[PDB]
Design an enzyme around this catalytic site. Structure first.
Site, PDB file in Angstrom:
ATOM      1  N   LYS A 104       0.825  -1.196   0.000  1.00 20.50           N
ATOM      2  CA  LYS A 104       0.000   0.000   0.000  1.00 20.50           C
ATOM      3  C   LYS A 104       0.865   1.255   0.000  1.00 20.50           C
ATOM      4  O   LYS A 104       1.747   1.438   0.831  1.00 20.50           O
ATOM      5  CB  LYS A 104      -0.840  -0.030   1.263  1.00 20.50           C
ATOM      6  CG  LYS A 104      -1.682   1.205   1.498  1.00 20.50           C
ATOM      7  CD  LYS A 104      -2.654   1.414   0.388  1.00 20.50           C
ATOM      8  CE  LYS A 104      -3.881   2.153   0.852  1.00 20.50           C
ATOM      9  NZ  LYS A 104      -4.320   3.113  -0.176  1.00 20.50           N
ATOM     10  N   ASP A 220     -10.231   6.951  12.537  1.00 15.43           N
ATOM     11  CA  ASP A 220     -10.652   6.758  11.158  1.00 15.43           C
ATOM     12  C   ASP A 220     -10.311   5.336  10.692  1.00 15.43           C
ATOM     13  O   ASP A 220     -10.308   5.054   9.501  1.00 15.43           O
ATOM     14  CB  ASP A 220     -10.085   7.880  10.276  1.00 15.43           C
ATOM     15  CG  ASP A 220     -10.713   9.244  10.531  1.00 15.43           C
ATOM     16  OD1 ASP A 220     -11.715   9.324  11.284  1.00 15.43           O
ATOM     17  OD2 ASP A 220     -10.197  10.230   9.966  1.00 15.43           O
TER      18      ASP A 220
HETATM   19  C1  LIG Z   1     -10.777  -6.913  -3.199  1.00 13.85           C
HETATM   20  O1  LIG Z   1     -10.779  -6.045  -2.074  1.00 13.85           O
HETATM   21  C2  LIG Z   1      -9.911  -6.307  -1.061  1.00 13.85           C
HETATM   22  C3  LIG Z   1      -8.998  -7.359  -1.021  1.00 13.85           C
HETATM   23  C4  LIG Z   1      -8.180  -7.535   0.079  1.00 13.85           C
HETATM   24  C5  LIG Z   1      -8.238  -6.671   1.158  1.00 13.85           C
HETATM   25  N1  LIG Z   1      -7.384  -6.935   2.248  1.00 13.85           N
HETATM   26  C6  LIG Z   1      -6.648  -6.084   3.018  1.00 13.85           C
HETATM   27  N2  LIG Z   1      -6.057  -6.580   4.129  1.00 13.85           N
HETATM   28  C7  LIG Z   1      -5.305  -5.764   4.885  1.00 13.85           C
HETATM   29  N3  LIG Z   1      -4.989  -4.486   4.657  1.00 13.85           N
HETATM   30  C8  LIG Z   1      -5.561  -3.992   3.548  1.00 13.85           C
HETATM   31  C9  LIG Z   1      -6.404  -4.721   2.676  1.00 13.85           C
HETATM   32  C10 LIG Z   1      -6.763  -3.819   1.626  1.00 13.85           C
HETATM   33  C11 LIG Z   1      -6.155  -2.634   1.850  1.00 13.85           C
HETATM   34  N4  LIG Z   1      -5.438  -2.703   3.050  1.00 13.85           N
HETATM   35  C12 LIG Z   1      -4.639  -1.639   3.577  1.00 13.85           C
HETATM   36  C13 LIG Z   1      -3.329  -1.881   3.921  1.00 13.85           C
HETATM   37  C14 LIG Z   1      -2.537  -0.856   4.417  1.00 13.85           C
HETATM   38  C15 LIG Z   1      -3.042   0.424   4.545  1.00 13.85           C
HETATM   39  C16 LIG Z   1      -2.167   1.537   5.059  1.00 13.85           C
HETATM   40  C17 LIG Z   1      -4.368   0.659   4.197  1.00 13.85           C
HETATM   41  C18 LIG Z   1      -4.925   2.045   4.321  1.00 13.85           C
HETATM   42  C19 LIG Z   1      -5.156  -0.373   3.697  1.00 13.85           C
HETATM   43  C20 LIG Z   1      -9.171  -5.632   1.141  1.00 13.85           C
HETATM   44  C21 LIG Z   1      -9.992  -5.470   0.043  1.00 13.85           C
HETATM   45 CL1  LIG Z   1     -11.152  -4.181  -0.017  1.00 13.85          CL
END
Ligand SMILES: COc1ccc(Nc2ncnc3c2ccn3-c2ccc(C)c(C)c2)cc1Cl
Ligand SMILES: COc1ccc(Nc2ncnc3c2ccn3-c2ccc(C)c(C)c2)cc1Cl
Lengths: 297, 297
Positions: A104, A220
């Site tokens: 990310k 948030d």
């Molecule tokens: C197909 O849609 C998905 C597939 C997989 C996921 N899984 C996730 N597991 C952990 N962190 C996540 C995610 C997605 C994003 N982030 C995440 C990481 C790090 C930061 C700093 C931020 C803001 C988000 C979520 C979705 Cl929606």
């Protein structure tokens, strides 16, 4: 894509260098202020593998190596997931090719905040033996290719690396990922059919985790909730997940109307209250825990 | 020693990066003007493996990879010789730990000259199928650790990696290495007992090689001559060397008064005539070949 190339290359270098560094008996104060930078310049050479001129910086390499260990992750496995094949984009964030990790892009501000909490984060992790719903921060880097500088962070995927998620929510209790929201959870009548023992274990984690967040004046964040449907997946034997890998998975109970498996954890915590220079961290957590406790009544 | 650490580290990186680069169908003009640089900065990290802040630059990596191949040397073997264990100093130059290679500090001027001849050097090598007495230049680098910058070059050892050399000369035909000199060769009455066929093969190499040198206006080179004594080594079966490795070795003939094996080749060629801004290159070669032809009469 030259930014993934540098990331794959930087991670590969990061772990190999680390393979020569001794596992310490403990982290020192200076470990939480450390970095490795590398700058490559190839003139008329290697034009084909990847960009000719790039930089790669890893923050606090000893610390994130420690966290990888405490989260049950082997460095060589980590390297493989991030290098054997390119991360897959999402219209944004990438997934490691084997779907174990999220990569990310973040801001320098986010990076600064990760730094400010990294000691307390570490301590919290030790204290709970790595069992928590908080994001699992696995590594943190700065890339430069051309005049393009970016900050990235790597977390454990909330979702199974193997079981597909047919329905996803991002819950706050009051831009944004491809998920359904508070109002949708409500309107849909969404239930989560887990047993009293599993609700109890989950919520008592949530309460401690969230309290940690409030103490840090973070805000948030949300609870990412993914539903695997087993009977749909008919159209490790069916319904099974390795808990040691798919660490957030919880089976539905014996009387669930549908054979579901659930993946829930906290995401996106790095907003500090002051950074918004509304809702304070206390009110946020109070609303947050009340909503989660509510949808699991 | 931080300069050997950086060298071992730079070579290791050099070869591994190269392992990802395709063997080309030919070298291009730009290959002879290319380089890779890498700069490492470790703040509060990795204090123990080696220096925190260093640079390493490799010149014309595709070219020297090609030359390693043409001289019968495998990149992984090369890497091992230079990294498995530290080079051994000489009161100066180092030896690879397995004694296959010489590592030698040189001046920026020398580096510039190596560059000016590198195309002709390559072409000469092709033309003779790698069979020559000239130095075999295997790699060329710039190191910086602290505010200490140095240039190094790697050549094949003239001497056996296995058979010991009890007596050594450095011959010019008219500071300096631990060897005996023209006058000593003469006063000692030193003979080299090789057969007419071997003298012929050796001298016809020398003549072409030296002519190449004169054409380039190079000077001040010499013939390094090392004698292994076999009966002494009693105080691969005795007297044997792998020619494929110990490429400059020549057995004494059947009637040699002593069981000797000889290692002779040209060294230290990078002085250009103009750089001395006496003897011109033509006179130098003429004296040089006359002396060698003489001591092998
Ligand atoms: C197909 O849609 C998905 C597939 C997989 C996921 N899984 C996730 N597991 C952990 N962190 C996540 C995610 C997605 C994003 N982030 C995440 C990481 C790090 C930061 C700093 C931020 C803001 C988000 C979520 C979705 Cl929606
Ligand atoms: C114990 O004494 C020795 C052991 C081994 C050797 N063997 C060598 N084979 C090839 N090049 C060599 C050597 C020594 C030095 N060089 C060399 C390299 C490169 C440059 C640029 C210059 C000037 C010399 C020579 C001696 Cl004396």
């Amino acid at each position: 894509d030259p930014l993934l190339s540098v990331l794959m290359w930087g991670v590969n270098h990061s772990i190999n260098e680390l393979s020569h560094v001794q596992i310490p008996v403990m982290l020192m104060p200076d470990d939480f202020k450390a970095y490795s930078k590398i700058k490559v310049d190839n003139h008329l050479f290697n034009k084909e593998n990847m960009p000719s001129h790039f930089k790669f910086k890893e923050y606090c390499p000893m610390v994130f190596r420690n966290l990888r260990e405490r989260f049950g992750i082997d460095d060589q496995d980590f390297q493989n997931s991030l290098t054997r094949s390119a991360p897959l984009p999402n219209d944004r964030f990438h997934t490691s090719y084997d779907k174990r990790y999220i990569i990310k892009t973040i801001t320098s501000e986010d990076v600064a905040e990760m730094h400010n909490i990294l000691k307390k984060y570490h301590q919290y992790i030790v204290e709970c033996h790595g069992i928590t719903l908080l994001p699992q921060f696995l590594g943190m880097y700065r890339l430069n290719v051309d005049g393009v500088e970016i900050y990235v962070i790597v977390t454990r995927n909330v979702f199974s690396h193997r079981l597909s998620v047919y329905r996803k929510y991002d819950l706050k209790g009051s831009k944004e990922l491809p998920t359904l929201k508070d109002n949708d959870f409500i309107n849909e009548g969404q239930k989560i059919y887990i047993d009293d023992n599993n609700k109890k274990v989950f919520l008592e984690k949530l309460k401690k985790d969230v309290e940690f967040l409030a103490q840090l004046k973070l805000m948030d964040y949300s609870l990412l909730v993914g539903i695997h449907d087993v009977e749909r997946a008919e159209q490790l034997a069916p319904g099974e997940f390795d808990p040691n890998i798919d660490v957030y998975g919880i089976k539905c109970h014996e009387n669930s109307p549908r054979k579901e498996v659930y993946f829930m954890a906290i995401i996106d915590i790095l907003t500090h209250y002051d950074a918004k220079k509304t809702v304070n961290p206390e009110q946020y957590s109070k609303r947050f825990l009340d909503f989660i406790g509510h949808i699991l009544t």
